[PDB]
PDB file of C-alpha atoms in Angstrom:
ATOM      1  CA  UNK X   1       8.605  15.397 -14.362  1.00  0.00           C
ATOM      2  CA  UNK X   2       9.138  17.570 -11.276  1.00  0.00           C
ATOM      3  CA  UNK X   3       6.087  18.605  -9.294  1.00  0.00           C
ATOM      4  CA  UNK X   4       7.497  21.067  -6.856  1.00  0.00           C
ATOM      5  CA  UNK X   5      10.617  20.493  -4.803  1.00  0.00           C
ATOM      6  CA  UNK X   6       9.386  17.353  -3.023  1.00  0.00           C
ATOM      7  CA  UNK X   7       7.772  15.170  -5.704  1.00  0.00           C
ATOM      8  CA  UNK X   8       8.486  13.824  -9.150  1.00  0.00           C
ATOM      9  CA  UNK X   9       6.254  11.913 -11.622  1.00  0.00           C
ATOM     10  CA  UNK X  10       7.932   9.299 -13.923  1.00  0.00           C
ATOM     11  CA  UNK X  11       6.889   6.491 -16.249  1.00  0.00           C
ATOM     12  CA  UNK X  12       7.529   3.117 -14.580  1.00  0.00           C
ATOM     13  CA  UNK X  13      10.022   2.518 -17.434  1.00  0.00           C
ATOM     14  CA  UNK X  14      11.840   5.678 -16.394  1.00  0.00           C
ATOM     15  CA  UNK X  15      11.645   4.746 -12.662  1.00  0.00           C
ATOM     16  CA  UNK X  16      13.235   1.415 -13.516  1.00  0.00           C
ATOM     17  CA  UNK X  17      15.962   3.131 -15.533  1.00  0.00           C
ATOM     18  CA  UNK X  18      16.903   5.411 -12.664  1.00  0.00           C
ATOM     19  CA  UNK X  19      17.065   2.654  -9.978  1.00  0.00           C
ATOM     20  CA  UNK X  20      19.370   0.806 -12.375  1.00  0.00           C
ATOM     21  CA  UNK X  21      21.888   3.531 -13.106  1.00  0.00           C
ATOM     22  CA  UNK X  22      21.904   4.568  -9.440  1.00  0.00           C
ATOM     23  CA  UNK X  23      22.704   1.048  -8.353  1.00  0.00           C
ATOM     24  CA  UNK X  24      19.719   1.528  -6.106  1.00  0.00           C
ATOM     25  CA  UNK X  25      18.898  -2.139  -6.162  1.00  0.00           C
ATOM     26  CA  UNK X  26      15.372  -3.437  -6.821  1.00  0.00           C
ATOM     27  CA  UNK X  27      11.946  -1.814  -6.394  1.00  0.00           C
ATOM     28  CA  UNK X  28       9.825  -3.683  -3.845  1.00  0.00           C
ATOM     29  CA  UNK X  29       7.580  -6.309  -5.439  1.00  0.00           C
ATOM     30  CA  UNK X  30       4.473  -4.446  -4.266  1.00  0.00           C
ATOM     31  CA  UNK X  31       4.952  -1.729  -6.913  1.00  0.00           C
ATOM     32  CA  UNK X  32       5.059  -4.490  -9.609  1.00  0.00           C
ATOM     33  CA  UNK X  33       7.218  -2.523 -11.965  1.00  0.00           C
ATOM     34  CA  UNK X  34       7.701  -4.547 -15.190  1.00  0.00           C
ATOM     35  CA  UNK X  35      11.313  -4.638 -16.340  1.00  0.00           C
ATOM     36  CA  UNK X  36      11.856  -2.679 -19.594  1.00  0.00           C
ATOM     37  CA  UNK X  37      14.751  -4.914 -20.735  1.00  0.00           C
ATOM     38  CA  UNK X  38      16.154  -8.386 -20.100  1.00  0.00           C
ATOM     39  CA  UNK X  39      19.911  -7.930 -20.833  1.00  0.00           C
ATOM     40  CA  UNK X  40      22.777  -5.485 -21.274  1.00  0.00           C
ATOM     41  CA  UNK X  41      22.279  -4.987 -24.978  1.00  0.00           C
ATOM     42  CA  UNK X  42      18.686  -3.984 -24.344  1.00  0.00           C
ATOM     43  CA  UNK X  43      19.713  -2.018 -21.309  1.00  0.00           C
ATOM     44  CA  UNK X  44      22.145   0.289 -23.089  1.00  0.00           C
ATOM     45  CA  UNK X  45      19.718   0.844 -25.923  1.00  0.00           C
ATOM     46  CA  UNK X  46      16.833   1.526 -23.551  1.00  0.00           C
ATOM     47  CA  UNK X  47      18.957   4.009 -21.614  1.00  0.00           C
ATOM     48  CA  UNK X  48      19.838   5.821 -24.878  1.00  0.00           C
ATOM     49  CA  UNK X  49      16.199   6.030 -26.040  1.00  0.00           C
ATOM     50  CA  UNK X  50      15.166   7.441 -22.667  1.00  0.00           C
ATOM     51  CA  UNK X  51      18.034   9.864 -22.067  1.00  0.00           C
ATOM     52  CA  UNK X  52      16.628  12.910 -23.897  1.00  0.00           C
ATOM     53  CA  UNK X  53      13.230  12.909 -22.231  1.00  0.00           C
ATOM     54  CA  UNK X  54      14.839  12.458 -18.777  1.00  0.00           C
ATOM     55  CA  UNK X  55      17.061  15.497 -19.549  1.00  0.00           C
ATOM     56  CA  UNK X  56      14.166  17.586 -20.918  1.00  0.00           C
ATOM     57  CA  UNK X  57      12.332  17.041 -17.659  1.00  0.00           C
ATOM     58  CA  UNK X  58      15.451  17.969 -15.635  1.00  0.00           C
ATOM     59  CA  UNK X  59      15.575  14.577 -13.885  1.00  0.00           C
ATOM     60  CA  UNK X  60      18.915  13.454 -15.461  1.00  0.00           C
ATOM     61  CA  UNK X  61      21.367  16.000 -16.909  1.00  0.00           C
ATOM     62  CA  UNK X  62      22.898  15.811 -20.415  1.00  0.00           C
ATOM     63  CA  UNK X  63      25.928  14.001 -18.891  1.00  0.00           C
ATOM     64  CA  UNK X  64      24.022  11.241 -17.199  1.00  0.00           C
ATOM     65  CA  UNK X  65      23.833  12.398 -13.547  1.00  0.00           C
ATOM     66  CA  UNK X  66      20.545  12.008 -11.675  1.00  0.00           C
ATOM     67  CA  UNK X  67      18.908  14.830  -9.624  1.00  0.00           C
ATOM     68  CA  UNK X  68      20.300  14.591  -6.061  1.00  0.00           C
ATOM     69  CA  UNK X  69      16.821  14.573  -4.435  1.00  0.00           C
ATOM     70  CA  UNK X  70      15.277  12.118  -6.859  1.00  0.00           C
ATOM     71  CA  UNK X  71      18.264   9.749  -6.358  1.00  0.00           C
ATOM     72  CA  UNK X  72      17.852   9.906  -2.582  1.00  0.00           C
ATOM     73  CA  UNK X  73      14.068   9.185  -2.842  1.00  0.00           C
ATOM     74  CA  UNK X  74      14.602   6.183  -5.181  1.00  0.00           C
ATOM     75  CA  UNK X  75      17.245   4.878  -2.819  1.00  0.00           C
ATOM     76  CA  UNK X  76      14.938   5.287   0.223  1.00  0.00           C
ATOM     77  CA  UNK X  77      12.261   3.219  -1.524  1.00  0.00           C
ATOM     78  CA  UNK X  78      14.587   0.471  -2.768  1.00  0.00           C
ATOM     79  CA  UNK X  79      16.461   0.200   0.517  1.00  0.00           C
ATOM     80  CA  UNK X  80      13.717   1.010   3.056  1.00  0.00           C
ATOM     81  CA  UNK X  81      14.425  -0.251   6.546  1.00  0.00           C
ATOM     82  CA  UNK X  82      10.711   0.181   7.541  1.00  0.00           C
ATOM     83  CA  UNK X  83       7.629   0.350   5.283  1.00  0.00           C
ATOM     84  CA  UNK X  84       3.945   0.080   4.627  1.00  0.00           C
ATOM     85  CA  UNK X  85       2.858  -1.832   1.490  1.00  0.00           C
ATOM     86  CA  UNK X  86      -0.288  -0.479  -0.085  1.00  0.00           C
ATOM     87  CA  UNK X  87      -2.388  -2.646  -2.447  1.00  0.00           C
ATOM     88  CA  UNK X  88      -5.357  -0.700  -3.838  1.00  0.00           C
ATOM     89  CA  UNK X  89      -8.212  -2.664  -5.460  1.00  0.00           C
ATOM     90  CA  UNK X  95      -2.974  -1.572 -11.138  1.00  0.00           C
ATOM     91  CA  UNK X  96      -2.731   0.913  -8.245  1.00  0.00           C
ATOM     92  CA  UNK X  97       0.102   0.195  -5.800  1.00  0.00           C
ATOM     93  CA  UNK X  98       1.776   2.207  -3.118  1.00  0.00           C
ATOM     94  CA  UNK X  99       4.510   2.112  -0.526  1.00  0.00           C
ATOM     95  CA  UNK X 100       5.461   4.253   2.343  1.00  0.00           C
ATOM     96  CA  UNK X 101       9.195   3.884   2.727  1.00  0.00           C
ATOM     97  CA  UNK X 102      11.313   4.893   5.758  1.00  0.00           C
ATOM     98  CA  UNK X 103      15.099   5.010   5.769  1.00  0.00           C
ATOM     99  CA  UNK X 104      17.259   6.960   8.212  1.00  0.00           C
ATOM    100  CA  UNK X 105      14.994   9.859   9.127  1.00  0.00           C
ATOM    101  CA  UNK X 106      13.538  10.128   5.649  1.00  0.00           C
ATOM    102  CA  UNK X 107       9.996   9.197   4.519  1.00  0.00           C
ATOM    103  CA  UNK X 108       9.134   8.720   0.835  1.00  0.00           C
ATOM    104  CA  UNK X 109       5.772   7.746  -0.645  1.00  0.00           C
ATOM    105  CA  UNK X 110       5.857   5.826  -3.908  1.00  0.00           C
ATOM    106  CA  UNK X 111       2.568   5.672  -5.736  1.00  0.00           C
ATOM    107  CA  UNK X 112       2.255   3.573  -8.900  1.00  0.00           C
ATOM    108  CA  UNK X 113      -0.735   4.094 -11.136  1.00  0.00           C
ATOM    109  CA  UNK X 114      -0.730   2.082 -14.362  1.00  0.00           C
ATOM    110  CA  UNK X 115       2.045   3.461 -16.522  1.00  0.00           C
ATOM    111  CA  UNK X 116       3.110   6.206 -14.066  1.00  0.00           C
ATOM    112  CA  UNK X 117       4.772   6.269 -10.623  1.00  0.00           C
ATOM    113  CA  UNK X 118       5.062   9.272  -8.356  1.00  0.00           C
ATOM    114  CA  UNK X 119       7.714   9.755  -5.660  1.00  0.00           C
ATOM    115  CA  UNK X 120       6.846  12.216  -2.857  1.00  0.00           C
ATOM    116  CA  UNK X 121       9.124  13.080  -0.015  1.00  0.00           C
ATOM    117  CA  UNK X 122       7.124  13.765   3.121  1.00  0.00           C
ATOM    118  CA  UNK X 123       7.281  14.893   6.727  1.00  0.00           C
ATOM    119  CA  UNK X 124       5.231  12.297   8.577  1.00  0.00           C
ATOM    120  CA  UNK X 125       5.722  13.118  12.277  1.00  0.00           C
ATOM    121  CA  UNK X 126       2.497  11.520  13.418  1.00  0.00           C
ATOM    122  CA  UNK X 127      -0.159   8.965  12.589  1.00  0.00           C
ATOM    123  CA  UNK X 128      -2.728  11.351  11.121  1.00  0.00           C
ATOM    124  CA  UNK X 129      -0.373  12.608   8.405  1.00  0.00           C
ATOM    125  CA  UNK X 130      -0.440   9.162   6.872  1.00  0.00           C
ATOM    126  CA  UNK X 131      -4.174   8.846   6.525  1.00  0.00           C
ATOM    127  CA  UNK X 132      -4.496  10.968   3.340  1.00  0.00           C
ATOM    128  CA  UNK X 133      -1.860   8.701   1.741  1.00  0.00           C
ATOM    129  CA  UNK X 134      -3.579   5.496   2.858  1.00  0.00           C
ATOM    130  CA  UNK X 135      -6.892   6.704   1.498  1.00  0.00           C
ATOM    131  CA  UNK X 136      -5.714   8.366  -1.806  1.00  0.00           C
ATOM    132  CA  UNK X 137      -6.772   5.397  -3.952  1.00  0.00           C
ATOM    133  CA  UNK X 138     -10.270   5.157  -2.464  1.00  0.00           C
ATOM    134  CA  UNK X 139     -13.538   6.997  -3.151  1.00  0.00           C
ATOM    135  CA  UNK X 140     -13.665   9.952  -0.802  1.00  0.00           C
ATOM    136  CA  UNK X 141     -16.358   8.322   1.337  1.00  0.00           C
ATOM    137  CA  UNK X 142     -17.124   9.551   4.824  1.00  0.00           C
ATOM    138  CA  UNK X 143     -16.941   7.018   7.682  1.00  0.00           C
ATOM    139  CA  UNK X 144     -19.785   4.508   7.709  1.00  0.00           C
ATOM    140  CA  UNK X 145     -22.083   4.582  10.715  1.00  0.00           C
ATOM    141  CA  UNK X 146     -22.560   1.196  12.442  1.00  0.00           C
ATOM    142  CA  UNK X 147     -21.640  -0.693  15.595  1.00  0.00           C
ATOM    143  CA  UNK X 148     -18.349  -2.682  15.493  1.00  0.00           C
ATOM    144  CA  UNK X 149     -18.512  -6.362  14.721  1.00  0.00           C
ATOM    145  CA  UNK X 150     -15.864  -9.087  14.680  1.00  0.00           C
ATOM    146  CA  UNK X 151     -15.313 -12.442  12.998  1.00  0.00           C
ATOM    147  CA  UNK X 152     -12.386 -14.745  12.557  1.00  0.00           C
ATOM    148  CA  UNK X 153     -10.036 -13.376   9.775  1.00  0.00           C
ATOM    149  CA  UNK X 154      -9.878 -16.757   8.102  1.00  0.00           C
ATOM    150  CA  UNK X 155     -13.702 -16.982   7.959  1.00  0.00           C
ATOM    151  CA  UNK X 156     -14.019 -13.559   6.290  1.00  0.00           C
ATOM    152  CA  UNK X 157     -11.395 -14.430   3.688  1.00  0.00           C
ATOM    153  CA  UNK X 158     -13.041 -17.865   3.254  1.00  0.00           C
ATOM    154  CA  UNK X 159     -16.439 -16.276   2.677  1.00  0.00           C
ATOM    155  CA  UNK X 160     -14.904 -13.841   0.117  1.00  0.00           C
ATOM    156  CA  UNK X 161     -13.277 -16.669  -1.807  1.00  0.00           C
ATOM    157  CA  UNK X 162     -16.502 -18.616  -1.875  1.00  0.00           C
ATOM    158  CA  UNK X 163     -18.100 -15.923  -4.082  1.00  0.00           C
ATOM    159  CA  UNK X 164     -14.879 -16.011  -6.205  1.00  0.00           C
ATOM    160  CA  UNK X 165     -15.918 -19.674  -6.534  1.00  0.00           C
ATOM    161  CA  UNK X 166     -19.506 -18.732  -7.383  1.00  0.00           C
ATOM    162  CA  UNK X 167     -21.315 -19.182  -4.095  1.00  0.00           C
ATOM    163  CA  UNK X 168     -24.502 -17.125  -3.373  1.00  0.00           C
ATOM    164  CA  UNK X 169     -24.198 -14.071  -1.059  1.00  0.00           C
ATOM    165  CA  UNK X 170     -27.497 -14.636   0.839  1.00  0.00           C
ATOM    166  CA  UNK X 171     -26.450 -18.163   1.582  1.00  0.00           C
ATOM    167  CA  UNK X 172     -22.896 -17.319   2.618  1.00  0.00           C
ATOM    168  CA  UNK X 173     -23.650 -14.333   4.829  1.00  0.00           C
ATOM    169  CA  UNK X 174     -26.655 -16.031   6.484  1.00  0.00           C
ATOM    170  CA  UNK X 175     -24.458 -18.818   7.850  1.00  0.00           C
ATOM    171  CA  UNK X 176     -21.711 -16.392   8.942  1.00  0.00           C
ATOM    172  CA  UNK X 177     -24.508 -15.053  11.108  1.00  0.00           C
ATOM    173  CA  UNK X 178     -24.824 -11.540   9.641  1.00  0.00           C
ATOM    174  CA  UNK X 179     -28.061 -10.112  11.241  1.00  0.00           C
ATOM    175  CA  UNK X 180     -30.692  -8.643   8.881  1.00  0.00           C
ATOM    176  CA  UNK X 181     -29.991  -5.130  10.189  1.00  0.00           C
ATOM    177  CA  UNK X 182     -26.351  -5.355   9.103  1.00  0.00           C
ATOM    178  CA  UNK X 183     -26.949  -7.084   5.793  1.00  0.00           C
ATOM    179  CA  UNK X 184     -26.910  -3.942   3.561  1.00  0.00           C
ATOM    180  CA  UNK X 185     -23.560  -2.807   5.018  1.00  0.00           C
ATOM    181  CA  UNK X 186     -21.923  -6.257   5.042  1.00  0.00           C
ATOM    182  CA  UNK X 187     -23.233  -7.130   1.568  1.00  0.00           C
ATOM    183  CA  UNK X 188     -21.817  -3.837   0.306  1.00  0.00           C
ATOM    184  CA  UNK X 189     -18.364  -5.013   1.584  1.00  0.00           C
ATOM    185  CA  UNK X 190     -18.657  -8.338  -0.203  1.00  0.00           C
ATOM    186  CA  UNK X 191     -19.355  -6.390  -3.394  1.00  0.00           C
ATOM    187  CA  UNK X 192     -16.822  -5.575  -6.105  1.00  0.00           C
ATOM    188  CA  UNK X 193     -18.074  -2.017  -6.627  1.00  0.00           C
ATOM    189  CA  UNK X 194     -16.125  -1.459  -3.404  1.00  0.00           C
ATOM    190  CA  UNK X 195     -12.832   0.274  -3.458  1.00  0.00           C
ATOM    191  CA  UNK X 196     -10.241  -0.820  -0.906  1.00  0.00           C
ATOM    192  CA  UNK X 197      -6.667  -0.899   0.208  1.00  0.00           C
ATOM    193  CA  UNK X 198      -4.755  -3.580   2.053  1.00  0.00           C
ATOM    194  CA  UNK X 199      -1.962  -2.334   4.308  1.00  0.00           C
ATOM    195  CA  UNK X 200       0.885  -4.533   5.364  1.00  0.00           C
ATOM    196  CA  UNK X 201       3.773  -3.259   7.531  1.00  0.00           C
ATOM    197  CA  UNK X 202       7.351  -4.405   7.259  1.00  0.00           C
ATOM    198  CA  UNK X 203      10.907  -3.906   8.365  1.00  0.00           C
ATOM    199  CA  UNK X 204      14.378  -4.990   7.505  1.00  0.00           C
ATOM    200  CA  UNK X 205      16.342  -6.284  10.388  1.00  0.00           C
ATOM    201  CA  UNK X 206      19.823  -7.681   9.730  1.00  0.00           C
ATOM    202  CA  UNK X 207      19.183  -8.941   6.239  1.00  0.00           C
ATOM    203  CA  UNK X 208      15.790 -10.351   7.453  1.00  0.00           C
ATOM    204  CA  UNK X 209      12.539  -9.215   6.057  1.00  0.00           C
ATOM    205  CA  UNK X 210       9.864  -9.234   8.760  1.00  0.00           C
ATOM    206  CA  UNK X 211       6.286  -8.329   7.822  1.00  0.00           C
ATOM    207  CA  UNK X 212       2.947  -8.381   9.671  1.00  0.00           C
ATOM    208  CA  UNK X 213       1.083 -11.721   9.158  1.00  0.00           C
ATOM    209  CA  UNK X 214      -2.178  -9.893   8.719  1.00  0.00           C
ATOM    210  CA  UNK X 215      -2.893  -6.497   7.344  1.00  0.00           C
ATOM    211  CA  UNK X 216      -5.230  -3.545   7.866  1.00  0.00           C
ATOM    212  CA  UNK X 217      -7.896  -2.929   5.241  1.00  0.00           C
ATOM    213  CA  UNK X 218      -9.757   0.303   4.416  1.00  0.00           C
ATOM    214  CA  UNK X 219     -12.932  -0.119   2.314  1.00  0.00           C
ATOM    215  CA  UNK X 220     -15.133   2.438   0.571  1.00  0.00           C
ATOM    216  CA  UNK X 221     -18.756   1.318  -0.228  1.00  0.00           C
ATOM    217  CA  UNK X 222     -22.004   3.283  -0.726  1.00  0.00           C
ATOM    218  CA  UNK X 223     -22.492   2.840   3.033  1.00  0.00           C
ATOM    219  CA  UNK X 224     -19.358   4.850   3.730  1.00  0.00           C
ATOM    220  CA  UNK X 225     -15.751   4.146   4.759  1.00  0.00           C
ATOM    221  CA  UNK X 226     -15.001   0.984   6.686  1.00  0.00           C
ATOM    222  CA  UNK X 227     -11.916  -0.063   8.650  1.00  0.00           C
ATOM    223  CA  UNK X 228     -10.973  -3.725   9.105  1.00  0.00           C
ATOM    224  CA  UNK X 229      -8.190  -4.308  11.605  1.00  0.00           C
ATOM    225  CA  UNK X 230      -6.760  -7.521  13.055  1.00  0.00           C
ATOM    226  CA  UNK X 231      -6.286  -8.701  16.628  1.00  0.00           C
ATOM    227  CA  UNK X 232      -4.413 -11.835  17.722  1.00  0.00           C
ATOM    228  CA  UNK X 233      -6.184 -14.331  19.942  1.00  0.00           C
ATOM    229  CA  UNK X 234      -4.453 -16.719  22.299  1.00  0.00           C
ATOM    230  CA  UNK X 235      -5.530 -19.756  20.209  1.00  0.00           C
ATOM    231  CA  UNK X 236      -3.217 -18.323  17.536  1.00  0.00           C
ATOM    232  CA  UNK X 237      -6.052 -17.378  15.158  1.00  0.00           C
ATOM    233  CA  UNK X 238      -6.695 -13.771  14.097  1.00  0.00           C
ATOM    234  CA  UNK X 239      -9.863 -11.837  14.662  1.00  0.00           C
ATOM    235  CA  UNK X 240     -10.984  -9.165  12.146  1.00  0.00           C
ATOM    236  CA  UNK X 241     -12.892  -6.167  13.526  1.00  0.00           C
ATOM    237  CA  UNK X 242     -15.055  -4.047  11.209  1.00  0.00           C
ATOM    238  CA  UNK X 243     -15.457  -0.445  12.420  1.00  0.00           C
ATOM    239  CA  UNK X 244     -16.203   3.082  11.016  1.00  0.00           C
ATOM    240  CA  UNK X 245     -13.130   4.184   9.053  1.00  0.00           C
ATOM    241  CA  UNK X 246     -12.580   7.585  10.707  1.00  0.00           C
ATOM    242  CA  UNK X 247      -9.155   9.204  10.482  1.00  0.00           C
ATOM    243  CA  UNK X 248      -8.688   8.458  14.206  1.00  0.00           C
ATOM    244  CA  UNK X 249      -9.543   4.769  13.912  1.00  0.00           C
ATOM    245  CA  UNK X 250      -7.374   4.322  10.832  1.00  0.00           C
ATOM    246  CA  UNK X 251      -4.415   6.073  12.486  1.00  0.00           C
ATOM    247  CA  UNK X 252      -4.684   3.970  15.599  1.00  0.00           C
ATOM    248  CA  UNK X 253      -5.002   0.686  13.689  1.00  0.00           C
ATOM    249  CA  UNK X 254      -1.904   1.411  11.498  1.00  0.00           C
ATOM    250  CA  UNK X 255       0.031   2.430  14.566  1.00  0.00           C
ATOM    251  CA  UNK X 256      -0.810  -0.847  16.347  1.00  0.00           C
ATOM    252  CA  UNK X 257       0.164  -2.696  13.165  1.00  0.00           C
ATOM    253  CA  UNK X 258       3.666  -1.215  13.034  1.00  0.00           C
ATOM    254  CA  UNK X 259       4.066  -1.621  16.837  1.00  0.00           C
ATOM    255  CA  UNK X 260       3.701  -5.447  16.382  1.00  0.00           C
ATOM    256  CA  UNK X 261       7.072  -5.538  14.509  1.00  0.00           C
ATOM    257  CA  UNK X 262      10.495  -5.947  16.236  1.00  0.00           C
ATOM    258  CA  UNK X 263      11.515  -2.252  15.844  1.00  0.00           C
ATOM    259  CA  UNK X 264       8.116  -1.127  17.074  1.00  0.00           C
ATOM    260  CA  UNK X 265       5.751   1.664  16.193  1.00  0.00           C
ATOM    261  CA  UNK X 266       6.683   4.528  13.905  1.00  0.00           C
ATOM    262  CA  UNK X 267       5.095   6.769  16.543  1.00  0.00           C
TER     263      UNK X 267
END
C-alpha cells in the first residue's frame, strides 16, 4: 500500500487493474507484467475481487476512484516520453519521465513499487540503477576495451557449453586480468542492463546498445559502449564508481534525438 507520500507498493495484478481502469494504456514490456484476465467477463470479476483490498489500502476509494498521485504515477510510466529500461539479472525496473515528472517503477516478482522522485542530476539516479545489485564497492583495475559483439559472442559460447579458459585465452585476456574477467563471465554475478529510450511523434527510439553495471567478488564494474567509425560498437570495462556510472548513463541519453536528461 502507501509508503509515504511519494511511493506505493502494489501486487502486479493490482498494478494492472489500476492501469486498466485509469485508461492509462499499457505498461512497458520491460516490466513484464502478466495480464490477470483475458476478456471483459474476467475483467469485471477480477476488478470486483480486488476492490476491497485496494480500498483497505487507501489506493482506490469505496466508489472506484483512484488516488490522484498514484494515478499520475501510473500514467507517467505508461505514457513516458523519455525513459531508462532496467533489466536486473524477475527483477525489472523503469525510470519514466513525462512532462517534468520522474517516476521509478520497480517490479520484483509478485510486487511492483512506484516511487515519484526529484532527479535533478546524474548522481541521483545511481542508487536506483544499483538497487538490484550486491552493494559492492568499485572494482580496482585499469580500463580495457573489446568489440561489443565479441563480448556478447563469448558470453553466448558458454551458454552453448564452451570452456572459459579456452574462450578468454583467445579473446586475449592477460593472466593478470583473468580473475576479474572470469568473475564477470560467471553467473554468481549480479548485473543490470540499462537501455535509454524516448517517444518522438509516435516513434519509439531506443539506444542500440546499453550500459551494464556488474557486481562480482572483485567489486563493481561498469561496461559502457562507444561507437566506432566502422559502425561497430566498442565495450569499455571500467571501475563502477558513482561518477563513472553517472557519466556513462548521461552519454547514453545524450545519443537520443531529444538529448541528455542533464
